[PDB]
Design a protein around this nucleic acid. Structure first.
Ligand SMILES: [Zn+2]
Ligand SMILES: [Zn+2]
Length: 44
DNA sequence: GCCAACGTTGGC
DNA sequence: GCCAACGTTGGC
């Protein structure tokens, strides 16, 4: 089962998208979360 | 059925 | 080894 965001790290507390990062810019094709919101624990 | 975004992988 | 496209799926 796919892992879940931790809710606690600084990225998880962010509430809105930066709209300036690659992930935000390519969302339609890339399907990724804003780079500034990606959970610290889901990178490792 | 929609939607946000994780897992896999493939291009670099 | 990074990172983004694609496929997918959990929650609604
Ligand atoms: Zn962003
Ligand atoms: Zn987190």
């Amino acid at each position: 089962k796919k892992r879940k965001r931790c809710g606690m790290c600084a990225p998880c507390r962010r509430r809105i998208n930066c709209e300036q990062c690659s992930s935000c810019r390519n969302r339609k094709t890339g399907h990724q979360i804003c780079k500034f919101r990606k959970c610290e624990e889901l990178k490792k």
